[PDB]
Each structure stands twice: as structure tokens, then as C-alpha cells.
Amino acid sequence: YDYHFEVNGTVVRHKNKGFGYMERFFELKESCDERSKLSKKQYERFNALFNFFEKNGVICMAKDAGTLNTSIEINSLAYHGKYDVMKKFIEEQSVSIEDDYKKAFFLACLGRWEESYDLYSNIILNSIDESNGCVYYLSQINRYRIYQSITQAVTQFNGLGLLTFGRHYKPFTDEFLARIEREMTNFNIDDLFNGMPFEFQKKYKILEFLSDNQFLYDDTVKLFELTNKVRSEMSEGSYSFGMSSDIVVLLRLYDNLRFLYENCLWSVSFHEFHQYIRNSMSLLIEKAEYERTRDIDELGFSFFGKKSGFFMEYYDFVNISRHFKIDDIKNLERSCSIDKIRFGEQEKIEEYLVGIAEEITKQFSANGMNVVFYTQFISEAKAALYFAKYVKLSEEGLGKIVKALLFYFPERDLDIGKRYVWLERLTKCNELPKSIISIIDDFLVLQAEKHIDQNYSEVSSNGLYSRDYGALIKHFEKNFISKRLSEITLCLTQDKQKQIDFLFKLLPLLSTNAKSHLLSFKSVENINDLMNGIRIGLIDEFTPEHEELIIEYLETRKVNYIVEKEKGIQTFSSNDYMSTFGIWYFLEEINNSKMEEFIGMDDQYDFFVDPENFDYKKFIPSWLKNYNDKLLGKIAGNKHMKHHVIEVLKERVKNSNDKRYLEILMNYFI
């Protein structure tokens, strides 16, 4: 506590009653002649200290400060995910115990935990004799941590793994799980530091915290500063010297991260570090949003209108990918305008994403598969591809990513619907070129071929299936014909009913002869068949004969409705066929006029057919919660109904304070 060392890289005095050795050292560094004054051995020591301080980034005194810069740089194959280089390093022959230390870390990061445990034990055997107290201590800590991770993994797999995996997996044998339990009996990490030689306890006290149950409590409690509200109205920047809390928090995070990864410490993988990273990043982004909003209010909208209080880069991208889950990313997005936040260093991000793609391909194309490695490689891969929507990619990289996403990402962690969502997010910032269209076409062909077998059936968690890939292809290429799917149709036969349906869902992609042959395999004979075809089968136009079915059904229902008035009884209803017909007429799909006679049975039908004479006291506002964008736009356009809808929406938003009604009001009707 003789001095304060600040994240900025400037040092200051603190409760020092004596000589200014640090100020003198900086003065000697400044002037060469003063250094020439020192002796020779002291000159060598000065050189060593100069290298050390420059490497750690200590610059000069605070008063002698200036426009100091700052840039993060981590030298670690593990931080950057160089799995192949790491494996090549493991395969070589060691030359030191420090090489063994780094190699055992690399083994831990690739999921090979028994090798890591054994190598740490061997290092412990050698290092006590080799008088490397630092490596001995750190190896003890890291081996205890690996033992803990193995122990929790075994419980997790034997408790729930057999279900999600579909088969009971045994990463570790019984002999190993017995031997380690025998070796690590009554072992306590709490007395490890106190049992070391006192010269070690004097030189390396700064490592004591590595043996505690929890660290990073002051770091977390210091996050309360980003939540202050008075600062925007009046802020002093009291943090350090003219530095806002944002910079201090971010540089503290970078220091923690670099220290843990560069020293090869296995605490980077535990729940506490991940939580700390999540909390820090979320609060920072939220604060930037708040500042932007308050600035826009106080000054003109032109002032910071789309200004980004948060600028993202490569390290932020990898941090969020490695430490966030999908729910956490969904919260940071609905909270703030991430689309307003701009990403930088996009070439390195592209490199990182292509690395992820190639590792996915290697992992799942090959028959061999590591279990713990897959489970610690599946979350980050999913997060990276989800957060790849805000970056701009080149065509070849986009193709590699899309192929890996569509063909090699396991169905157990990404089904058909989530695959579609992930894929469709990537077209928001990169307009679909022909190459990816071809890849999607290949995927559709393969999935069609899967359907020859009867038992096969697609399974999705959100109701999205191949139909949606088909529609997406045609969205960007209006004129598109699949020749492989066309010849699939032309070889088609009646008994291939499942293929009949599958290719019915994909009608627009087929050719003229293909679709003619296919439609030769189905026909409509009744209104139920008509609705089934419109839903599935894509009946585009209401044939003259099709409208006659509608009127016949409507007249039958008119007779039944007269008999119902006679009854005065109505048990229950499930789906309204009348309201759909009313909407179809209102959208100008049915051109007949007879159904106007069949009026006065259902409120919604009348509302959609004859808006002008509609008794608007019977309007039910919740109807508006079922319509989609096109129908709401049409309703806004029509004149007989615009102001009544305005009134009901305005009465609801006033009383209930509901946000869906407010958004409907403000997006279309005004």
C-alpha cells in the first residue's frame, strides 16, 4: 500500500512516509544519463525491471500522465480456440515443467480429463524436488479443480445424461473413479498455502486468493456504480481521474480475464466466472442505452439520435459467445437496441466463426466423438452462430457457415425449426446470393429423400418445417425451379403418398410438368377438401365451381340457423368457417355477391362483409389480437371502419394500459 496502481497504467503515492523509490525509478527511466550513473549489475537489474514493467503495462506517474491509450491482447491458444494447434502442441515432446503445466491445461480444455489429472500428478511429483514452489502450488490447485469438475460431471451424466443423450454414457471407468476418490480423501484446499515454506508465503502472498472457495465478490459489488441515476443529471466522473465507471469496469474485466487465461488456471471454466462476465457485460450495455436516451431527450433528437454508447469488438464478441446462454442474449436484445450497436473488426470475427464451423464439421462428421468436449463445445457454438446476425460476412465464409449449420449441427441440439430460425437470421445483414440458395436446395433434396421410409417424420419445437425453407428461397428469387426435385416429382407414383404430401408443400419450386403431374394426384370435391387444400396443397385461386361450394354450404347453414332460432340451443363451437369466408371476401378473393344475402348470423362475418352498416357496439376488441400485418394494414386503409377502430383501441389503451394494443395503434392506425 505504498502506492496506488490504476488500471489506466499510472501510479500514485499512498500512505508512503519515506523515499520516493518509484518516482526515482521513473526519473531514471526517463533520462539515459542517470541510468549510465548506476553500476553494471544494477544496470542489468534495471533492464530486467524495465522489461517486466513494460510487459505488464505500467507507464509513469499520474501527474506526468497524458493521453494514455489502452488495448487488450491475450496470448493464449485457449482463448482464441486454436484446437488443432493445441493438439499439435500436446503431441510434441516436452522440454521443461512449464511446458508440462501448459500442456496439462490444454488437455483440460479439450475434455481429456484423466490425462490432465495424471499429468498434474506427475508434475507434482517432479516439482517439489525441482524446487519450483510456484508450479507445485499451482499444480495442486489445478488438480483439485479438475477433480471437482470430474466429480460433478459423473453425477450429471448418471442423473440426467442417459435421457437427453438417449443412451447412458460412461466417459470415466470405475477403476479411475475409485482410485481418485481414494487419493483425494479428506484433502482440504484451505490449509495448502499455510503449509508451504515461509519464504514462499512471503514472496507469493498475492496467490493466496487462488485457494479460496469464492473470489470476485468486490468486483461484483462494484457493479452497483453502473446503476446510478443521478450521474446523468450531474456526474463528476469521480472514478479514478476523469474516468467514468464504464472504463474502470471494462479494464478490470480485461485484467481478470488475461490473468486467468495467460497463467493457465482452470478456474476460468467455473460458474462464478461465467456469471461475473454476464453481469458485467449486461450492465455496461444497459448503461450505454440509458445515456443515449437521456441525451436524446435533453438535446435535439439529431443529438445522439442513433449514437451508440457501446462499441463492440472482437474480444467482446468472443466473451459473449463463450459465457452467455441464448436466454441471456434474448434479454440483452429486448432490453436495448443491439441493432443500433455497431460491430468492429469484422475480419477477425469472420475468422473465429469459420473456425467454429470447421470444428463442428470435424466433431460430427467423424464417427469418433468426445462427450465432455462436445457439451463444452455445443453452447459456445450455438451462441456464436446466434450472435452472427449483427456481423457482415463474405460469400465463401457464409457458405462454410451455412453448410455446417444445415448439415453437421446435431439434431439433438438444433432441430428443423431452430435450424430455420438460425439460418434466417443470417440473411438480415447479408442478402442471399446464389451459392447459399444452392446449399438450401441440396438440404431440401436430402430431406425429401429421407421421406421414402414410412416411419420418418420431421419434429420441430415451433411449428416450422421444410415449407419455410422453400418459401425463404422464393422470397429472394421469384423465378426458381429445382430440377432435382422436379425429376423427383416426374418419377413419382401414387403409392408414394408421403412424398405426395411432402412435395405438395413445395409446389412453387417445381416445374410446369412436375406440378401438372403432381396435381393430377389430388382433387377437391367438398368444402372440407377445399379448406384442407388451401391450408396444405396451396390452392391459389377460388375456381368458379369452388365459390358455388361456398354458397351451398352457406345456404345449408342458413337453413340450420333458422332451425337453430327454433331450437334456441347451441352446444359448442370449435372453428369458424364463416369468418374466414368473410375475410376472404373483404380481401377481394371471393367475387360473388350472393353471400351478402346470407348476412346477420355471425358478428365477424358481417363486420368484414358490410362495414358501413355494421353495428359497432358488437365489435370485440380482442379480434384485433389475431390479425396479422397485411390484414391490419387493409383494415386501416378502409374508410368505413378506421375511426371506430381508432376509438376502441384508444379506449383500451387508456384503461388497460396494454402494450400490444398500443403497438397496434401506433404502427398502423396513426
Binding site: 430460425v421 417424420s457 419434429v459 419445437s461 415451433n462 411449428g463 419455410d468 418459401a471 425463404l472 422470397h475 372440407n528 379448406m531 384442407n532 388451401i534 391450408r535 390452392i539 391459389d540 352446444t571 359448442f572 370449435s574 372453428n575 368457417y577 375475410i583 376472404w584 380481401l587 378473393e589 370485440i620 380482442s622 389480437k625 389475431n626 390479425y627 396479422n628 400485418d629 397485411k630 390484414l631 396494454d658 400490444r660
Partner: protein
């Protein structure tokens, strides 16, 4: 009215639906019988569609634990509902809530917000 099975009920206002963990037995068109069914609703306001599609939400019906596909007009008449606690207050509660709410499929098992 008061029961221990109403502590899991949630109301979703964007689509005016109830989410509850219940299972239903359904007689359809007074001729078909099915047991242990439920529904899943998806909210999706920007879907690539045509003039036939004018709804924001899509419903999936599950029979037993297997996806169900019905082409016949889906007339629906509840006959029995069951909760994990298995109480029978749910059978009466379901009819009341269904009568109160006008939207189709008032009570479902899950809601998926796609935007």
C-alpha cells in the same frame, strides 16, 4: 374455486391465452375419440405467407405424446381434463375459462414467441 392446482396458471396477453399444464380427452365431430391430447401455440407476426394466411399465431395438436394431423373439420367437445395433481376442479374450471375467453383454443400447454 380455490385449489392448489391454480398456482401454475399463467395468462399471456399478447395473444389472450391461458398456459396451464393439463391433459385433455377430446371427442371430435361426435364420431372420433382421442385421449391425452394438448395444444402448442406459436406467435409469429412476420411469416412469409399469402392471402389465405391472415393469422398471427399457429396451433399444433398433439395426441398421446405423438403429433396429430387432422384434415376433417376440427369440431371440438371437451369431456375430461386432468392436471399433474390430478384434481377434478380443473374439469369445471376449463369450461368456465373457455366460455369467458372468445379466442380459439383458450388453454394451451406452451407458447413460443417467434418475435
Amino acid at each position: 374455486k380455490d385449489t392448489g392446482a391454480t398456482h401454475d396458471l399463467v395468462y399471456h396477453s399478447k395473444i389472450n391465452t391461458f398456459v396451464w399444464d393439463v391433459e385433455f380427452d377430446i371427442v371430435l365431430s361426435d364420431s372420433k375419440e382421442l385421449n391425452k391430447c394438448y395444444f402448442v401455440k406459436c406467435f409469429n407476426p412476420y411469416r412469409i405467407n399469402g392471402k389465405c394466411d391472415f393469422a398471427v399465431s399457429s396451433i399444433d395438436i398433439f395426441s398421446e405424446g405423438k403429433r396429430l394431423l387432422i384434415e376433417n373439420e376440427f369440431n371440438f367437445k371437451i369431456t375430461k381434463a386432468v392436471h399433474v395433481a390430478t384434481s377434478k376442479d380443473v374439469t369445471e374450471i376449463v369450461l368456465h375459462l373457455s366460455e369467458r375467453i372468445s379466442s380459439p383454443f383458450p388453454i394451451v400447454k406452451e407458447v413460443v414467441y417467434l418475435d
